[PDB]
Amino acid sequence: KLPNIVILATGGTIAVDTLINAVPEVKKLANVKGEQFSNMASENMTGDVVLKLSQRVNELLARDDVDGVVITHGTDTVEESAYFLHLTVKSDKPVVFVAAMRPATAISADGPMNLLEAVRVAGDKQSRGRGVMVVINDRIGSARYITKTNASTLDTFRANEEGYLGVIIGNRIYYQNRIDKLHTTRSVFDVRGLTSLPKVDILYGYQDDPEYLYDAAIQHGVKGIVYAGMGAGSVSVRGIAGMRKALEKGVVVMRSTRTGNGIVPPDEELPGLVSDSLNPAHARILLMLALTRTSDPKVIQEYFHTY
Amino acid sequence: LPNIVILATGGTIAGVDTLINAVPEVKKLANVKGEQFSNMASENMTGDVVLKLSQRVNELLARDDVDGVVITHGTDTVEESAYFLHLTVKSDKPVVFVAAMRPATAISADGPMNLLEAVRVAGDKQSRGRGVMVVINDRIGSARYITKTNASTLDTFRANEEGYLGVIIGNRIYYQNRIDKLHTTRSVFDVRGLTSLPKVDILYGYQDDPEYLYDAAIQHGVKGIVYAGMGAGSVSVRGIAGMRKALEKGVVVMRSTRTGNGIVPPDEELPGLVSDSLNPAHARILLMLALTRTSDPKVIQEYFHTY
Amino acid sequence: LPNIVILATGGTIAALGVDTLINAVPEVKKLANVKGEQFSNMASENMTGDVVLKLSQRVNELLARDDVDGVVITHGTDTVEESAYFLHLTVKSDKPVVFVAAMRPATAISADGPMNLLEAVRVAGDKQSRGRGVMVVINDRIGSARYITKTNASTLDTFRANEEGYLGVIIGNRIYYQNRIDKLHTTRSVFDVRGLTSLPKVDILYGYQDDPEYLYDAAIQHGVKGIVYAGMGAGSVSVRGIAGMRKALEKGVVVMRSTRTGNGIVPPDEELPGLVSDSLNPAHARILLMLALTRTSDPKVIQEYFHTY
Amino acid sequence: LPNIVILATGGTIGVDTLINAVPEVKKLANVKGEQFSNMASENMTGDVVLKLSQRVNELLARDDVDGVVITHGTDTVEESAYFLHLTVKSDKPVVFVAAMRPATAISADGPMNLLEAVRVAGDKQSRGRGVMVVINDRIGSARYITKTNASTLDTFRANEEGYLGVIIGNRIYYQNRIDKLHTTRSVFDVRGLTSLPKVDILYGYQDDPEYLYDAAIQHGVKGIVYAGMGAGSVSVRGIAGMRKALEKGVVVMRSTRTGNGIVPPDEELPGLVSDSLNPAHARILLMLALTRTSDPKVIQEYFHTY
């Protein structure tokens, strides 16, 4: 009859028991059991905690008595945590992240409805093999493309060029797309038996950008640097000098964009690698994981075109 | 026939003379005069050159034989240069920035039509007193709201929540909005005689963001820091430590958002000021100009809600 | 505290007494001194011109009073853009007129109505809201009746103006105004319906491959005075549609070419018959054409209205 | 080089005149042009689209044809593209291309659009993705793409569904694969047909008239697509009109005039619902559905799967 869903809470203004007792209708959709993983605002989520989360989810999905998992998280960095598990979960079972833009105590709070939709999505057989998803505001987005585009609105999560995987209207799921990238069960990345991740920082691009910020990053032991550049990863003379110093020290430089959408195309005349359509936040996640398997720039560049 | 001066600063759209002769149709819309101001890619445009550009335009618009000015610029940082002039040009006469996403030698190059449209706008009497504008892909955008949203497409310039000031279809201008902010003739920012501006850097917000970046900035004498934060300017414990140190040293901290759109609301629990709806790039420009007149956080905050 | 009147016409947001609505969201009572009035109670798909005509007259009556600072009108979402644009052109006052609605029923989990209503009252009572034309408030956004339209059949963020943006937004209980529309409205509008009891008949026909000529004949047979064409692309017409439009013109009917696309400008074209709708979509175009026919039948004058309102 | 045939039907984008105008395409593939017709898309008719589909099926069956590019006007390309999306029985790429600015205009978009269409049609990674529309560096699916703006270059978009891929720097970046039935897995075949069932579209608005339904019924339509208010809502006059049609055996399909979104089922109302298909796309699927059956339950399932 009903599928077994585990609700793993990590924090956020949305929620775990109380949360569940707030919308009992979920009991009509599946057999739920809640587990408190942590309780912190997403702005304080760290790589080591995300790493533990990924490991815990792989453990649960290995069980025969678990059909899917729903994860409550804060909205601010959910695109970072979601993409990490998108690349590290070794199962076709549904992993759904859910969040809320208004606190549970607010008038017309969105959390209750988002949670109900998240459970319905995770328990549906149609949801298997689609990669990690983020459910909110009646939409279903892919971890690889979804990002928070507005600071304070309910409809903040969008993928302008890629669209949504599907939508939920009238308690029915309408799947529209399947992403054409590698993920989950077909990913080469595995963090089981790992307890630490390579250090990667992000530097911004703008008029008068300082070369000294690069010096500080290098001296503090970074293994990689993601550049949120102007336009299509364009670099000033000061940025070029800073990138050269990094390259001599064995640090991997990845050029992305501050614009918010689009493709950063390769350019033999500029230093570093290019991020494809990955934004700064997503690019950092993939670079950290890539560095746990290799340091060859040719191999890393290919990961960015396929993941 | 209106007298229009075309001031060239660089960009792939281009000297200024061969530019004008490459598209002779503009000669039928106005009596144009070209002037070479500089010639570099926009990623290398610096605050001191922009300061000089602003002063030169103020000089030109003061003459009775000049009805408007068109400035060719690279797309990558045009939103920075345009917003600077939006706040410093003391004239009612039209100032229009124009650019191109494809090189002049490209098949289906967009530069020729963009230039023709910019001249049409600068010469039209109904274009007076609307603030500095950016004309590209048949659209007219305000310097205060427009931004490059895509790394590589022709339709990259958009103001998702604010829309366009107007559009140009079939050689006719259709004006839709007037911005409800202060600019040009009613701005308090006077830059006559200045040779340099206060140093202001931008730091990114993400999972595991480091404290040492704030240290480096302070260590190098910055007078202000724009934070492109998570969500609505959220700050991690590490980011908060870095900010408190800057405030002690007397540095102004402005909290913005890395999301791309929306309002960052006030919050007494967090340190620093808030950017209203200005993105990181626009926020930096306003903060520098504010630092030329005051250091009182109360005054600066009001500037961000009215400009 | 401002004096605001809440006029209920229907919609899932409120069917229930307008008073029960106010008692349900008591917070509004701390933003202003509110008074409710039940004008009607029907789904917007059933709102008619004669009814919208009465609503306009009643609102002009209320705003003429010194003891009334603004009005909030609850309405269904489906045709609110039509009702809102009608008042946008006929209300002769600078006081705020704010339409509000809800995409989810009052009994739904995470219903949007309560917050939408609180935001509408805050907008209607703010002094900075005067002289901005009729507005539509929903999902933290403030949109102009002239540009706003329902763009999605079932989502909460359905109301948008893709090319024109929002007039402002409401975040953290604070209003942030961004634009002022550059079009004529309210106090500077020539349309005056006080004293009118009926409206000219205007129908809308769609443009698509294989479109039939007989739909034009049917409309003509039933005495329409105007026809709005939701055309392909920039108001393009097939050989069958042109034959239909020519028969209509021969019979005294005014033809207006708009677009089915959803956004943009339908530019002038002297090769084709009829007038053009500027950036007005089919629904908005029908409202302006009906009002225009109460004043004149001159094509040159009507065309000018479409470029200024 | 792959073998690509450019089939011209019209549009402001002499098929060989265009080929001589943009000779860059000969470095991308061995091209060959064919003049199928020459009319503005607003004048494209079902009988013509039927012949176009039969011709394309015929060409893609050959050993020496790797893909086909079709030049078309922008106004109804979404209608012609979706018709072929449902009737072409092959995995080989079928790409529709158009231009918003005249070939004589300054900064004309046609040359680049064509170059990108040929690149997409000749790439092996483009197989089995369904019929596509290429324009302004974007690759869109015929099932989701629509002309959203009357006159801009960036008019073709799929707000909720996004693009299949994008073309930047002479390289193709595929992003999605649609999750709907099409081409080789479609049950619609129009081989042998010379005519299609009559289907008309009626608009929903305040004061909508009942007599328009009577008119359609009088002229023998087999189906009616309703571009309704909101989620296919209907006024009392509309309900009266729909009831008359149903008792006469006419199939009523409720869609939406809004431009995007799902029209959910509601049995308190008359007729079927269009899922996420807009009015123009809905009429096309309904006509083809009527060549197989008149059963309401079956037609409704087609609308949830195609």
Ligand SMILES: N[C@@H](CCC(=O)O)C(=O)O
């Ligand atoms: N900064 C908080 C906001 C509340 C929320 O998004 O739930 C977080 O990201 O957790």
Ligand SMILES: N[C@@H](CCC(=O)O)C(=O)O
């Ligand atoms: N990075 C170059 C790109 C070319 C252009 O936008 O003109 C610039 O911003 O100048």
Ligand SMILES: N[C@@H](CCC(=O)O)C(=O)O
């Ligand atoms: N068709 C209903 C939907 C519910 C609503 O929008 O309030 C109406 O427009 O009244």
Ligand SMILES: N[C@@H](CCC(=O)O)C(=O)O
């Ligand atoms: N109405 C014309 C416009 C030109 C074009 O799109 O090519 C057509 O759709 O053919």
